[PDB]
Design a protein around this ligand. Structure first.
Ligand SMILES: O=C(CP(=O)(O)O)O[C@@H]1[C@@H](OP(=O)(O)O)[C@H](OP(=O)(O)O)[C@H](OCc2ccccc2)[C@H](OP(=O)(O)O)[C@H]1OP(=O)(O)O
Ligand SMILES: Nc1ncnc2c1ncn2[C@@H]1O[C@H](COP(=O)(O)OP(=O)(O)NP(=O)(O)O)[C@@H](O)[C@H]1O
Ligand SMILES: [Mg+2]
Ligand SMILES: [Mg+2]
Ligand SMILES: [Mg+2]
Length: 325
């Protein structure tokens, strides 16, 4: 029989252009059949009624019942490409940074301000006009303030008096804009946050996309922190700049992929002061508008499936060569 690769995610993701491009390519593997789980089934059917698969590609996004996906994996024991339990931890910036630190991965100096919503003023925060002190640790402006929820994209940057003060409020893109300047110079007074040192880059973020620990595609985009106007090409797509990762960065990708147990994993790098710092790990993410990435990603994923399962299915398989970017 065929090896069944099940895809379990919200319809917005399962029916996205990059997903469809990759799945049509995985389907070219002679012994692989792809089954995409319907959103109505994921949401409303018990896991006992979900389709069977031998290999499961499943990931959380807004509205996704991660508890059910975990229960399905426990019930059916498929080969899991992106670990499901780690997807709880990827939703919490505190957990993400804790893992990065434990892997010896360079990241911005940071401190966690945990605030009790019942007693918001009893937390260990002291504020001056050009700095904050978080659990005693001093952050001179410029510094960055991130909600502890990794799903909350309201990241603020606070400017020093020497630069005019105020703040840059970032958010999920709304059309032409990804951030806006605010004259507010004082930090947020409700919620829990990570405070971290601002890393000076050339004005771009490096976005890294892994497919297993030995393949990573990278590209750069204008930092939303800069002025907040999104750069677009004549075709209306956001401008992307070419990147080739250095040896240090290829190792970072290897580490992130394995540490979070996410075969397919996106993360952000800040190239600053002659090193590269991880500031965000997003989990499952595909590159868009690259035919070569679609070819590479599908081949790698198919090869992973075959390597793991071909012996069980008595299918002859010789491990092929694979790209690194
Ligand atoms: O960024 C994420 C989290 P993830 O990246 O885990 O999905 O979700 C966004 C929504 O942002 P919040 O996390 O709620 O702050 C966003 O809500 P707003 O409309 O309030 O900004 C918004 O959520 C709309 C929404 C989806 C599902 C149920 C209810 C609402 C957005 O969806 P879309 O606008 O890109 O379709 C979600 O991204 P997704 O594509 O689902 O990953
Ligand atoms: N410590 C830092 N120093 C300088 N710039 C930073 C720092 N942290 C974040 N940024 C910038 O702010 C942007 C958003 O921060 P990030 O931690 O990626 O938030 P996010 O809400 O998880 N974004 P997403 O990639 O959509 O999940 C980054 O892409 C950088 O341009
Ligand atoms: Mg096939
Ligand atoms: Mg990011
Ligand atoms: Mg993120």
């Amino acid at each position: 029989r065929q090896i069944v690769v099940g895809i379990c995610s919200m319809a917005k993701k399962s029916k996205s252009k990059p997903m469809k491009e990759i799945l049509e390519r995985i389907s070219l593997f002679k012994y692989i059949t792809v089954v995409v789980f319907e959103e109505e089934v994921i949401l409303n059917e018990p896991v006992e009624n979900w389709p069977l698969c031998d290999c499961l590609i499943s990931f959380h996004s807004k509205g996704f019942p991660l508890d059910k996906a975990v229960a399905y994996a426990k019930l059916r024991n498929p080969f899991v490409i992106n670990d499901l339990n780690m997807q709880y931890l990827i939703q919490d910036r505190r957990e993400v940074y804790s893992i990065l630190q434990a892997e010896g991965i360079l990241l911005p100096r940071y401190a966690i301000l945990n605030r009790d919503p019942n007693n918001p003023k009893e937390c260990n925060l002291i504020e001056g006009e050009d700095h904050v002190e978080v659990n005693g640790e001093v952050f001179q402006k410029p510094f960055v303030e991130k909600p502890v929820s990794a799903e909350d994209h309201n990241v603020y940057i606070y400017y020093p008096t020497s630069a005019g003060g105020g703040s840059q409020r970032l958010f999920r893109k709304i059309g032409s804009r990804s951030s806006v300047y605010s004259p507010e110079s004082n930090v947020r007074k409700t919620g829990s946050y990570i405070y971290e040192e601002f890393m000076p880059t050339d004005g771009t973020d490096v976005k890294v996309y892994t497919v297993g620990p030995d393949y990573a595609h990278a590209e750069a985009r204008k930092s939303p922190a800069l002025d907040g106007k999104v750069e677009r090409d004549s075709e209306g797509k956001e401008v992307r700049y070419p990147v080739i990762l250095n040896a240090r960065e290829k190792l970072i990708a290897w580490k992130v992929c394995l540490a979070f147990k996410q075969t397919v994993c996106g993360f952000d790098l800040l190239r600053a002061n002659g090193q590269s710092y991880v500031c965000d790990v997003n989990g499952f993410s595909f590159v868009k508008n690259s035919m070569k990435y679609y070819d590479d990603c599908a081949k790698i994923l198919g090869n992973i499936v075959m390597r793991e399962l071909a012996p069980q299915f008595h299918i002859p398989w010789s491990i092929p060569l694979e790209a690194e970017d």
